[PDB]
Design a protein around this nucleic acid. Structure first.
Ligand code: GDP
Ligand code: PHE
Lengths: 205, 371, 82
RNA sequence: GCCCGGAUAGCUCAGUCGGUAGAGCAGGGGAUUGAAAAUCCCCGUGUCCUUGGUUCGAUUCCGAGUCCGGGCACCA
RNA sequence: GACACGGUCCAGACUCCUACGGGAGGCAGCAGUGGGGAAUAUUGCACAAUGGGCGCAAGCCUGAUGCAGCCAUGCCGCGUGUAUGAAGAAGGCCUUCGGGUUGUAAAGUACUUUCAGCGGGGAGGAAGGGAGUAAAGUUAAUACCUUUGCUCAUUGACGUUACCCGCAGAAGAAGCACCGGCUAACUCCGUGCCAGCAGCCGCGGUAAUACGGAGGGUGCAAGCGUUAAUCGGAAUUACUGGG
RNA sequence: AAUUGAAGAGUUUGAUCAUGGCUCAGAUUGAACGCUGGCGGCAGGCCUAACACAUGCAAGUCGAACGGUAACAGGAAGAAGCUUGCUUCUUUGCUGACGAGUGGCGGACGGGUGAGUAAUGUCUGGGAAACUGCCUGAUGGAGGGGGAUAACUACUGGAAAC
């Protein structure tokens, strides 16, 4: 259900940094960004009506690495919730297990975060859970399995989180490497460089 | 895959040597152990008008799947080579250590020479009675004199000593010599379909004699033929309308299949072992053409002459690619050609077939290679 | 004859039982007059395992209804005393 | 498994009791026109399904294989 | 209680046995076969569980049921690895032949291992019932019988289960439609109103963003497109809501 | 806390606005085909011929109803080999149980199909001129006799059925 391909062609498609290749380098730069979407990507875009709705719709999916059917399922699950449907979106999409692991800093990249959740190394409430799309319950702890705790990879990942934002809707221990949770993520507390305004419209038609 | 054949003398141990390779290669590699009764009593088959008596034995090798032909009579070996009823490549020379090379064993080397049988892997049998190192070298020396005269290099053909009686019973001390015998064959389940039925209430009923393997009711089996290959599962084996679970090689029993209509299985198919054989449409063969008064032709044919090959259950037509130098194949030739088939089918270097055209006898050949 | 029996619901390899009151001449998940409580034999070690509405049941036995073996076992499982 | 009829240049068929294969509808190559039509100038492009025999010579004579169509079987 | 699926008598049709007089049968019950058709699976296992029938009970029957096998038919979860990696290569392609692009892609290197394959641990679905025994009812009785505690031996088709641990090695796992506007995403070459494309408007007549291929990119994903079918769009049957 | 809910474009024409059909953009399917195809969970899997059918199987149980016991396993009397109780072993319904028969109970449940049917049906809301095995509440009773038949014997028709 993932991409598993040249996952930086996505950043050149929209121009906005997706952080899919955070890694050991501060800023990528070895990607020839902003002027190479494809072989004929030198031609200026048309920016059509259906496209403006589409271009940010695919972008958010390229960020979360979510299946379109899975995106549509989360869409209608957000439709049957209280308040603004657009706001109902980002709360649930920030509820995906590996994404919280990414916010905790245990995962260098989202791809690395999901590669850890799949390999039964992650543990929530003393329970080994493997589904990446596990909706995190309000105020709960998430840690790493003992016999696979800090095995050279997540070790390198701990230094990376020091230069990250580390949001205010959770709390990371980093001593025993515990990913504790607080109140539901607010729209004003995230990156805020994404527009959910247009996303609600694409599925309206 | 390569088909071999025990050429030799009566009372030498050709049938027990054939039983030696098929049994022990079925315990450490795979296949089916054959009983001594079927290798001796060969069934009768009418090949192009004249009835022949041959026994087709098969066993599995780590690399390929080697076949084996064995005739109980000396009269049957005359037809086997000079015409080519049972196509053979690695002719196993069976010479006894007690008696030694005798006139009937000498003829088979000359009979294979004039025709074109390229490989002869010699195995000296019956060496469990005599114990003398000077005698071991003397019988081995009479064999080297019996191959050099017929255009066969005696310095590269391997010689393996042994005894086939205890190679059949199970004494491990002699089994290592049977394995290197088959090992030297490298360097130097299968079921032909003969009849098909369909009874009301069961489905498709396929009948044929088993050449190799053991059949269980409820196992996954594959079907290979000249038509579109499919997959099935064993749902019953019956003999004379009587239940027989353990289907062994040699038994001409009827098998029941799973989920196939009558229009998909016909004469020319083969129930094979799952994922063990691929189809071939391109191979090579060396044939013999007989005279008009004895059944064949009296005039040669051209390149492009496409006769019908009847291999063990088929009547498939194939186009002939005559080699350079060969333009007109006249009756009495023992020359070769490259055979191209119109249908994907399991073709091995040794599977036997009769060649017919005009609705009658034309000739027979020896499959040498698969291109 | 009215009987108090079970009703296999839920799914394959994960049963469930909604004890009901129906007739002996009907199907297992057939037509019934009233359902009274349920039973979850493979639920979990939690606060809720089985709810039996006894009062309504005693109301039916007085009419002439016969209880089933597995059903009566639940009545002793509810422990009339404590 | 067995028995007949079609297998004839793109297509439908004629020609046979041995003698170097026809016709029709075609279709098409060129001048003209932005391009065709009309008009004018000129035409077979065939393994007679495959393969062989009785050979000065086989489409046709005797045979088979395979494809298609049309009839009957047999019942582990 | 039927005017009766696995009952009766009668007539007819389709089959069958036949000692030719006379008889037998009903898969629209589980499977299964012929045929029909564009198209739809095993002549499986157990009564462990629920329920049904008989019996005081024990048990017995249970193609109801509970499971298994089979099919991508649909939904849903998940995997085909991640990090690093510029001479920004080879090869492919385009080209203002400068170079760009495929492209961090790969190779190389460092780690990890779900699900598979191999070998061991191991729930729950189980409530009862059989025998024994204590007490209390019942009785003339410490008997019999019943009920309530308890003990013992246990009862599992699925089942080489669920789940868990461990071993080995990136090791076994990615295609499908599209690319003129509608509608997201392009050029070149070959073929020249020929071959073909197609949902509609329409393209191809020797310079095709629409034909075929190649490269690139685009949409979706173990699914992708197509066809058949309904509703919606259709306020083109309008009561809501038209003339 | 419990219906937080509605998009359009192309196409008549030289060009425009209209009226007005046609088409597509979406969702879905008891699906089929083409192609490809790793595992698992839960559902569904003969829509056409209500077409015809091989074979096995799909509803039997009760000895706490009775006569019997044809078998199986004990007991008991006995009988013979002979290791004098180690065995062989012929009678016997005396028991456990049990083919066939009589009787009770079920067979009208469960399972499948949608052919028929436009109101004798179904759905909705009421109703009175009914019956109701099995289970249950309440009040009493449960006294006394006879005549047959299946199983089983003898004979016997019929290929079988019977
Ligand atoms: N001692 C001894 N005798 C043998 C050996 N092989 C076969 N024989 C004997 O030879 C006899 C006949 O041999 P067989 O194989 O029937 O010969 P064919 O049928 O004419 O091939 C049998 O009695 C076997 O005992 C052996 O290796 N050693
Ligand atoms: C059916 O009986 C087969 N097992 C044996 C057979 C007999 C006669 C002809 C063909 C096969």
């Amino acid at each position: 259900a993932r991409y598993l391909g040249p996952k930086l062609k996505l950043s050149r498609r929209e121009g906005t940094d997706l952080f899919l290749k955070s890694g050991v380098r501060a800023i990528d730069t070895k990607c020839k960004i902003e002027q190479a979407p494809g072989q004929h990507g030198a031609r200026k875009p048309r920016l059509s009506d259906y496209g403006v709705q589409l271009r940010e719709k695919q972008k958010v999916r390229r960020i979360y690495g979510v299946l379109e059917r899975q995106f549509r399922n989360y869409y209608k699950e957000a439709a049957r919730l209280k308040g603004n449907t657009g706001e109902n979106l980002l709360a649930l999409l920030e509820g995906r297990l590996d994404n919280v692991v990414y916010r905790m800093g245990f995962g260098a990249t989202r791809a690395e975060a999901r590669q850890l959740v799949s390999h039964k190394a992650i543990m929530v409430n003393g329970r080994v859970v493997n589904i990446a799309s596990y909706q995190v319950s309000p105020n709960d702890v998430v840690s790493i399995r003992e016999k696979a705790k800090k095995q050279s990879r997540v070790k390198a990942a701990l230094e990376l989180a020091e230069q990250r934002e580390k949001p205010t809707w959770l709390e990371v221990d980093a001593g025993k490497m515990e990913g504790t949770f607080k109140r539901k993520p607010e729209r004003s507390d995230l990156s805020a460089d994404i527009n959910e305004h247009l996303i609600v419209e694409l599925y309206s038609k | 895959h390569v088909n071999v054949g025990t050429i030799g003398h009566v009372d030498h141990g050709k049938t027990t040597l054939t039983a030696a390779i098929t049994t022990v290669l079925a315990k450490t590699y795979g296949g089916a152990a054959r009983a001594f009764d079927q290798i001796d009593n060969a069934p009768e088959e009418k090949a192009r008008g004249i009835t022949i008596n041959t026994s087709h034995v098969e066993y599995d090798t780590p690399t390929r799947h080697y076949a084996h032909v064995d005739c109980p009579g000396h009269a049957d070996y005359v037809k086997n080579m000079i015409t080519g009823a049972a196509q053979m490549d690695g002719a196993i020379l069976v010479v006894a250590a007690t008696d030694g090379p005798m006139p009937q064993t000498r003829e088979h080397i000359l009979l294979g020479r004039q025709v074109g049988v390229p490989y002869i892997i010699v195995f000296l049998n019956k060496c469990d009675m005599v114990d003398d190192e000077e005698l071991l070298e003397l019988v081995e020396m009479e064999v080297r004199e019996l191959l050099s005269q017929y255009d066969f290099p005696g310095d590269d053909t391997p010689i393996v000593r042994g005894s086939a009686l205890k190679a059949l019973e199970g004494d491990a001390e002699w089994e290592a010599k049977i394995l290197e015998l088959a090992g030297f064959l490298d360097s130097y389940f299968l079921l032909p379909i003969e009849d098909v039925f369909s009874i009301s209430g069961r489905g498709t009923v396929v009948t044929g004699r088993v050449e190799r393997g053991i059949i269980k009711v409820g196992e996954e089996v594959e079907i290979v033929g000249i038509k579109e290959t499919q997959k099935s599962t064993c749902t019953g084996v019956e003999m004379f309308r009587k239940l027989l679970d353990e289907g062994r090689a040699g038994e001409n029993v009827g098998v029941l299949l799973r989920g196939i209509k009558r229009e998909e299985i016909e004469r020319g198919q083969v129930l094979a072992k799952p994922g063990t054989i691929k189809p071939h449409t391109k191979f090579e063969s060396e044939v013999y053409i007989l005279s008009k008064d004895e059944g064949g032709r009296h005039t040669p044919f051209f390149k492009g002459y496409r006769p019908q090959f009847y291999f063990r259950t088929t009547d498939v037509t194939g186009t002939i690619e005559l080699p350079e130098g060969v333009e007109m194949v006249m009756p009495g030739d023992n020359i070769k050609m490259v055979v191209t088939l119109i249908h994907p089918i399991a073709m091995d270097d040794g599977l036997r077939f009769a060649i017919r055209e005009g609705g009658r006898t034309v000739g027979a050949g020896v499959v040498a290679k698969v291109l | 004859m009215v009987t108090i029996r079970l009703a296999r619901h839920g799914a394959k390899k994960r049963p469930f039982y909604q004890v009901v009151v129906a007739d002996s001449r009907n199907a297992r998940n057939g037509r019934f007059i009233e359902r009274v409580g349920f039973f979850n034999p493979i639920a979990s070690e939690k606060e809720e395992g089985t709810r039996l509405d006894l009062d309504r049941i005693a109301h039916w036995v007085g009419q002439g209804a016969t209880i089933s073996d597995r059903v009566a076992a639940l009545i002793k499982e509810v422990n009339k005393a404590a």
